Amino acid sequence: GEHALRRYPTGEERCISCKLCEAICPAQAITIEAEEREDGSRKTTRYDIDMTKCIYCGFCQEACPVDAIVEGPNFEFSTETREELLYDKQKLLENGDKWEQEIAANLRTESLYR
Amino acid sequence: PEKTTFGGLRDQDRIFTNIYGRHDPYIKGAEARGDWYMTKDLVGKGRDWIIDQIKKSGLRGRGGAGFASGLKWSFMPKVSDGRPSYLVVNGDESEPGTCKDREIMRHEPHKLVEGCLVAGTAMGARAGYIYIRGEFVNERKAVERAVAEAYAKGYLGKNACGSGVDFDLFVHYGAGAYICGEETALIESLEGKQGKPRLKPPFPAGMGLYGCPTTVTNVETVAVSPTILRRGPEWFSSFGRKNNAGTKLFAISGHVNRPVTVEEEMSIPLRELIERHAGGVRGGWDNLLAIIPGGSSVPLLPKKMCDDVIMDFDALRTAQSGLGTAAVIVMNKDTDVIDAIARLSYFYKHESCGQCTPCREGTGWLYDIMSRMRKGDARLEEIDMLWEITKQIEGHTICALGDAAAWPVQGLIRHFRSEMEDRIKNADQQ
Amino acid sequence: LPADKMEVFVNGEAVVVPKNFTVLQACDAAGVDVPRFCYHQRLSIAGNCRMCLVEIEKAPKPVASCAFPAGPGMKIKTDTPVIKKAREGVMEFLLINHPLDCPICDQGGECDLQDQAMIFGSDRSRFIEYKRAVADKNLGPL
Amino acid sequence: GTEKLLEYKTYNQGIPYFDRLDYVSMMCMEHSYVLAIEQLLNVAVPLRG
Amino acid sequence: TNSTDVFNVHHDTPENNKDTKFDFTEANYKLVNKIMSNYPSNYKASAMIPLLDLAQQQNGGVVSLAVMNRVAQILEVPPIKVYEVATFFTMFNRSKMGKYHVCICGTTPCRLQGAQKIEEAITKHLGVGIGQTTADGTFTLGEMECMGACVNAPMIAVADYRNGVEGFSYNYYEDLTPQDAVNILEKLKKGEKPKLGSQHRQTAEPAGAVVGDKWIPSSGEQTLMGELPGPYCRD
Amino acid sequence: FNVPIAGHGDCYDRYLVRVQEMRESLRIIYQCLNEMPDGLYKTPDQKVSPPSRGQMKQSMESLIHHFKLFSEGYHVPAGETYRAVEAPKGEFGVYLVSR
Amino acid sequence: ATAPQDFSLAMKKADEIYSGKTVKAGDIGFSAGVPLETYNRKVRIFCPAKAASQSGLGRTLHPSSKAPQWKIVFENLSKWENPLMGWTSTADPLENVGRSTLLFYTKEEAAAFCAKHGWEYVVDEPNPRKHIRQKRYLGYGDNYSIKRKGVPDLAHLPSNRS
Amino acid sequence: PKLVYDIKYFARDYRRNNSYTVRSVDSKTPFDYSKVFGSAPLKPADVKTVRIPEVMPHRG
Amino acid sequence: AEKNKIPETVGGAAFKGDLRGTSAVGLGDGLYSHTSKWMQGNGKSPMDYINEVEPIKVKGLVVASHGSDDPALGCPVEYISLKGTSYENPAVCKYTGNRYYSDCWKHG
Ligand SMILES: Cc1cc2nc3c(=O)[nH]c(=O)nc-3n(C[C@H](O)[C@H](O)[C@H](O)COP(=O)(O)O)c2cc1C
Ligand code: SF4
Ligand code: SF4
Ligand code: SF4
Ligand code: SF4
Ligand code: FES
Ligand code: FES
Ligand SMILES: [Zn+2]
């Protein structure tokens, strides 16, 4: 369903800007640009997904090595303007925060199979 | 010397005579024992005569290679192209089972110096370096005193020993590394760099110390050469079997009633050596798990093979082992073979210089796997994996330390797979 | 074979090269590409990685192409199964202590190690032990 | 323009095209594509799959 | 159970850092000149290891950064070469060292005859452990590989770093049972000089073996007993 | 399973064929359910199939294979092939040309 | 350099058996049906050089390489940023076609294609790569030669000293 | 799985080990109709049939 | 000031005085901090979260880091050198940002 960037339990984002999800995206819906953070971490300065270009294949969730990007269980995300459907890093992180427990339970169940 | 049976070397046939240090090891005793006797004549006879006499003697190289000494010495260039020739004596004796070279350095210093003179004349080497282990401080002091004495009486230097030949000898010492015993790594260490072996397709005879033709030979070969030229090549050839003629210094260590260093003709039975000179295995011959014949590099042999095995190069090759150095190590039934071979694997992990990928990584891998097997943590398939890794290392390294790391583990797998399986299963069972 | 040029056989095909070339140089002249990590055209030959191993009929054991001088009438085999197995083993030894830092490595799309792992390596590992760890030090602003 | 779009994508990136070629029967449509890639790749499918 | 040096990079310490100054004393400098004379003038870097050993003996057993830089200046080489060689070899100690450096061989031939129990007795009596200097600073414990003393397998080696170049000795104590090792170390604490070589026997004669905590004296067949053959020449 | 056949060719005959095809597919499903094997569901080769997640997180070679399969993808040998399947609407085939 | 000995054999054979009929330069461009201002764009025919990060020779013009390596590329045009989302916006229809799909084995093939469509082209030959080691380090033996510091002077010998 | 501790891709590499051989065919040499119709049945009893392949190739 | 300052790294997973790898994003807008470029609010940043977590003492010279507690539900396994590490200057996991330090090298 709706995409969501995830955080570690400490509150640090899981994303390490490998940029594999952008390379595997069949529709080219993900644009990523990154930098070195002041502490020294490899972190993204931009992570936006076009939900009017997404095909919800789930390939990006497959390619991510740290489980940073997941397709959440939410299918109620219609909008009244197309601009609200161009997600960005802050919106994706907020969506990950809102659905954290459900996503974690689904991932714990799914880990057994794969 | 009889073709049927070999053993029981007599005192009259022993080259190394103050090996036990009952007499003065310095120049006064050395002259009275037959050292520096008629070196003028032997050296004056020419390099060609010495080379042919060494070739006829059949002297193979002590130190592990076993390569014929005369042919190696004959590979040295005959005429200078502007580059001097060097003789380097490998007195670095790092090997986990070998103690034999230290007695020669400390109790027969002058035989080694006379041999250096003879061999340098045989190879046309202006200068010579005696590499000694850094740990052997006192042995080095003895050798240095011998060199100074030989210089004082004119045995060395210009017009050495009265013959129209010129030879200068130096004593150099390392800082501790098993790899520095290898021919190229020793040359690199003496040049002043890290003791990392050089790829062999350039050979030391072509380019060696300071880019000049060099030959690296063990202390024992250099020491035995002068008396071979004095006593005679036929006398040297008589003792051993075909292709394996001379006497060799056997250092018996481990679980034996008396650990001894002794000189014996090659092709003695291992049982005969252990029972006569070492006093027998602690607890009798019945109390044998295994015997490492040629120091730790070569694969071990089980008791059954030790029954009929003969102390020779080619025969130990037939028994899937080798007489690298006459460093025979005896293990009791009480001994845990797994732990000793794991300690040898740790030795090789510690002594790798790290230059090439296969040794640097696979030797540590081997140590880790052996450590897990010492406790039974591993699975049964881990043994087959261990054999595969040993095959991966062998042949793909710059020098032979990868091979020397692979071999003991392969011997353990080949002859004592039952005990490893027992340990792995029992730990799971209990 | 005019004067300095000799003839060498690489995988059963005749190549004319100067005398001063090595085995790797003739293999490049033959169109065969040998896996390399430490050999560089403008740097001194090292021979440490041992990934260039090929087979010479004369030699008993595989030799390093970068540092082996080529000889007249030498036959060079770069596709023998022993060479394939040696390549895979060397690749395993290279990867056992390598950190699992591919996503965070800035060499991710341009790594020789990854590409030669895919081409000349096995797809799976048997290493379960602890890997080596190094502490980095500053070499400057760049 | 599906056929020309396939030319700009990798083989695994082009599988979702076949699902959307026929919205009634998706599995059969992607199946032929994966079979052709398997034939060219000489890949053997396990029996459970 | 790591040895003295755990770092292959320079660890800044109040004793060891850049400002520290090391130079050879005049007599040690004469020894330096004699050491260099053995190697060709153009290939002067051949003396790096003997010079580093001499500087180690002078500096009390530690090869400091100033020592390496001084040796590199004298040999006219980039300092990285001296760093590499000082790091490669084992005898070169790059950390602070005690008055005595006691080394126990743990390789296989020593481990069969009981090197483990020797080390256990030594670490109990000294009370620190391998790689750790005594709290007094009198002994630094170390494990080294084969020392060339396999026939006299249970053995230790001690280095006298107190007096300096004039009074430095690297001696071997062999055929030793744990109680003998403890006795040798107590003698070393007093300053009394113990018996060089094997305690029970002179050298690698056929005299007996160390079994457990006791020496079992067995003497059977001897070879070099009698009159030595002497000079001979082929005719 | 048995092929359903009619002869007239009219609309009714094709409707009857499609119903019988549904029944034959039910039979095939029952056989699939009863004979479903156990083991791998994807090819063991990891140079054409992605590694498992624990495996990529524990092995260097598997992380390399995962990275190069999710960025570059596998390389298909030069060749051409036409593979057809019995789709519900008929025969669906792909003519794939690889360089 | 020997032979691929695969489908490329039949590929090359189909090439040599068949041929194309000659037409005047630019005539096919009218048949193509694309905007005629496309052919006003200028063409650069080049082979990419090797990336400095990697040591593989596949991408280069080397006997190892069996793939087409000569690209037709068009000149770069204006690019801007989307005011709303900062995406890179463009109006160039031919932005990625030449890099992505226009690959040719030989320079003459790309020149023929350009002349057939009417594109003006400039061919840039790659800088030649010769695998010749320098004389100082021509071989592994040269690393440990006397060239480093000269032949060892023997004036340090005790006989020569005294 | 026997691939856990035994890794050898070159033995299990079928993708890169395919090749194409070359032949030349000429009209002068007659076709062998004996091969085509000599093995053909002349009576119902002699009919031989090729069974449908049950499974596609798998590595096991 | 930030307009003419050299981009620098605080040094938690880097060194105190190094250059920071920077793209040109936000250069026109005038933002020169990593978090400013992507967060427009005044809330707590994830870097503020990771700084609040304290370094953890471990035994040995190497620690295995899986990011999360379960190995297959977090970052790839990583082996971090604990040599020359203390509470004030801890080692860092590059994937997770967790900080570790050990006293074993000091022979303890
Ligand atoms: C790793 C390694 C260590 C070696 N250590 C020694 C050694 O300590 N003493 C020795 O005489 N030979 C040692 N050798 C063998 C050397 O090749 C030696 O210099 C040479 O074989 C002497 O030749 P020789 O048999 O004619 O005397 C070692 C070889 C290797 C590969
Ligand atoms: S689900 Fe597929 S299309 Fe959507 S963002 Fe992820 S990879 Fe791209
Ligand atoms: S979401 Fe995952 S795949 Fe995408 S850039 Fe971040 S870590 Fe990489
Ligand atoms: S085999 Fe080991 S010791 Fe020999 S060169 Fe290679 S890494 Fe060094
Ligand atoms: S990209 Fe290459 S160098 Fe970096 S971690 Fe991966 S394999 Fe190692
Ligand atoms: S390229 Fe490394 S050994 Fe030749
Ligand atoms: S094994 Fe200890 S001195 Fe030889
Ligand atoms: Zn972590």
Side-chain angles (χ1 to χ4, degrees), chain B residues 169-181:
Chain B
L169 201 50
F170 309 97
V171 177
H172 177 101
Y173 57 97
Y178 171 58
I179 193 66
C180 287

Side-chain angles (χ1 to χ4, degrees), chain B residues 109-131:
Chain B
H110 268 292
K111 292 182 181 180
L112 165 75
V113 175
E114 183 178 1
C116 308
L117 181 65
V118 176
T121 57
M123 294 182 286
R126 178 65 179 86
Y129 287 90
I130 309 179
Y131 200 83

Side-chain angles (χ1 to χ4, degrees), chain B residues 167-189:
Chain B
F167 189 70
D168 288 292
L169 201 50
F170 309 97
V171 177
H172 177 101
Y173 57 97
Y178 171 58
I179 193 66
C180 287
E182 190 276 331
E183 293 207 12
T184 61
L186 184 137
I187 285 154
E188 277 215 34
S189 69

Side-chain angles (χ1 to χ4, degrees), chain B residues 199 201-202 355-358 360-362 365 368-369 372 382 384-385 388-389 391-393 395-398 403, chain C residues 46-50 53 61-62 64 67-69 86 88-90 92-94 96-97 126-130 132:
Chain B
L199 278 52
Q355 198 184 15
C356 65
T357 290
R360 169 205 330 127
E361 305 272 278
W365 201 2
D368 296 7
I369 305 170
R372 292 184 291 113
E382 294 293 328
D384 291 331
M385 188 202 51
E388 293 179 354
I389 296 154
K391 293 312 201 192
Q392 291 189 333
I393 308 177
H396 309 158
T397 49
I398 293 159
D403 292 331
Chain C
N48 55 55
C49 80
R50 319 281 317 171
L53 297 193
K61 65 179 73 175
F68 207 72
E88 287 191 357
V90 173
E92 190 176 38
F93 289 134
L94 279 171
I96 55 168
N97 286 288
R126 67 184 68 188
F127 190 67
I128 62 170
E129 279 90 9
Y130 270 84
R132 65 183 180 179

Side-chain angles (χ1 to χ4, degrees), chain B residues 116-286:
Chain B
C116 308
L117 181 65
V118 176
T121 57
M123 294 182 286
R126 178 65 179 86
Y129 287 90
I130 309 179
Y131 200 83
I132 297 169
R133 264 183 77 158
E135 280 101 4
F136 289 168
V137 181
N138 316 313
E139 281 72 63
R140 185 177 65 246
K141 287 165 175 161
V143 172
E144 293 179 353
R145 179 161 155 191
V147 160
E149 273 163 335
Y151 268 122
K153 291 177 71 68
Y155 287 150
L156 281 178
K158 261 186 282 166
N159 189 359
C161 274
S163 179
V165 65
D166 189 359
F167 189 70
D168 288 292
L169 201 50
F170 309 97
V171 177
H172 177 101
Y173 57 97
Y178 171 58
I179 193 66
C180 287
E182 190 276 331
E183 293 207 12
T184 61
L186 184 137
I187 285 154
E188 277 215 34
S189 69
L190 188 153
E191 293 179 354
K193 280 73 176 175
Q194 283 174 129
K196 295 193 183 224
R198 294 179 293 173
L199 278 52
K200 298 298 293 295
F203 274 105
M207 314 174 96
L209 183 62
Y210 318 131
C212 289
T214 55
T215 300
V216 186
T217 61
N218 193 29
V219 287
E220 183 178 1
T221 300
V222 178
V224 300
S225 63
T227 187
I228 280 164
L229 277 296
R230 292 189 296 272
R231 207 89 56 91
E234 65 183 1
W235 166 89
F236 182 76
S237 296
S238 66
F239 300 126
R241 292 184 292 113
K242 298 296 289 183
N243 189 359
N244 296 294
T247 61
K248 182 175 174 66
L249 261 173
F250 296 89
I252 298 89
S253 66
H255 299 117
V256 298
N257 279 108
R258 319 177 307 261
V260 176
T261 192
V262 76
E263 183 178 1
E264 188 53 65
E265 52 194 276
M266 294 183 286
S267 296
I268 190 167
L270 179 52
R271 184 177 178 179
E272 183 178 1
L273 188 74
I274 301 299
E275 277 176 3
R276 295 179 66 250
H277 299 279
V281 176
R282 293 180 181 177
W285 189 261
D286 291 331

